Design a protein around this ligand. Sequence first.
Ligand SMILES: O=C(C1=C(c2ccc(CCCOc3c(F)ccc(F)c3Cl)cc2)C[C@H]2CNC[C@@H]1N2)N(Cc1cccc(Cl)c1Cl)C1CC1
Ligand SMILES: *[C@@H]1O[C@H](CO)[C@@H](O)[C@H](O)[C@H]1NC(C)=O
Length: 333
Amino acid sequence: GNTTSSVILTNYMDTQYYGEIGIGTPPQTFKVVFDTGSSNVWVPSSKCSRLYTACVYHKLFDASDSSSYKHNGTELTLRYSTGTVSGFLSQDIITVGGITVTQMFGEVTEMPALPFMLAEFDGVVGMGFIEQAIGRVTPIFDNIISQGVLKEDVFSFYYNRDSSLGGQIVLGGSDPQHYEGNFHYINLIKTGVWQIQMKGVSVGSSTLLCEDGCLALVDTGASYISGSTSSIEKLMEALGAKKRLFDYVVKCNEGPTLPDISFHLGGKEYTLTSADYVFQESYSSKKLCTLAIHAMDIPPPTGPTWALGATFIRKFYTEFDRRNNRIGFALAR
Ligand SMILES: O=C(C1=C(c2ccc(CCCOc3c(F)ccc(F)c3Cl)cc2)C[C@H]2CNC[C@@H]1N2)N(Cc1cccc(Cl)c1Cl)C1CC1
Ligand SMILES: *[C@@H]1O[C@H](CO)[C@@H](O)[C@H](O)[C@H]1NC(C)=O
């Protein structure tokens, strides 16, 4: 086809990048994260109890207000770290940029207060494959591909630093105004997951990690770069960082002196300087500065794996190519 559709993202604090979609007739709008690490569309249901903090603070989809809704009712569940997210399947018309698609999505009726009540967005549009869809529900980008409207069966992410355009997703191509040079591509290890081979992770110009190869999930829905607890332990030792309960930290004054961390993907070292991975909220020796790298043990079959989230994407404009089952990175502007 002939279309590319872009959707403007708002950057909240360098951790949440979301844009709007519309569901139903007339459209009920929702701020959503576009998440290559997941495969389902989810918004909160109007059937969600107001005793869920995550529901009270978010917009709720109301099927009783949409003329185009088609009931399903199939229960679906995501076993999230802090508790179950669950709800039920519904079908409605969803608009993303200029694209309109009839889509099955989960209406969430219960989920943990944490981290969901902290989300500035209402929902999540999974950009991953049917292979990983809960209930094997056809994902949105599959439905869009089927419509034959896109210039190319790709979508791209631009995540800005904070903070001004917060970010941009492009459906059907990329946006040259937001990268420089050309893409370099890496083949997916397999179709079904936006996961590539990584050959190594270096601190400074020496390769401390992943020396015998490892996996890299490219996960637009993740705020941070993540590695297994054991990998991150070693990285943070190499960096001199201290473990807090939920993050790692350095004295703010040594932030700018932290080494380059390099990820070796395809034929390129993708290098983050300390400016890329330290939340430099002060330069004081009296304060602790958080690192935009965290431990996360992603269970099989996806994990164990590294995850390259917003931290990585802010630096490298990313194209996810369904036609060619590959991910392309270019230096973000
Ligand atoms: O933690 C996730 C992740 C995933 C995730 C995807 C869907 C869900 C269920 C739907 C939740 O819908 C939300 C919501 F995300 C936030 C508020 C809501 F009201 C609703 Cl209904 C939960 C987790 C999947 C997986 C790969 N990408 C990443 C991460 N791990 N997410 C939640 C999240 C990420 C970062 C900050 C915050 Cl505050 C949140 Cl809640 C989803 C935004 C991407
Ligand atoms: C809901 O849609 C799914 C297709 O993914 C189908 O399996 C199911 O039968 C439908 N549910 C009902 C009860 O209508």
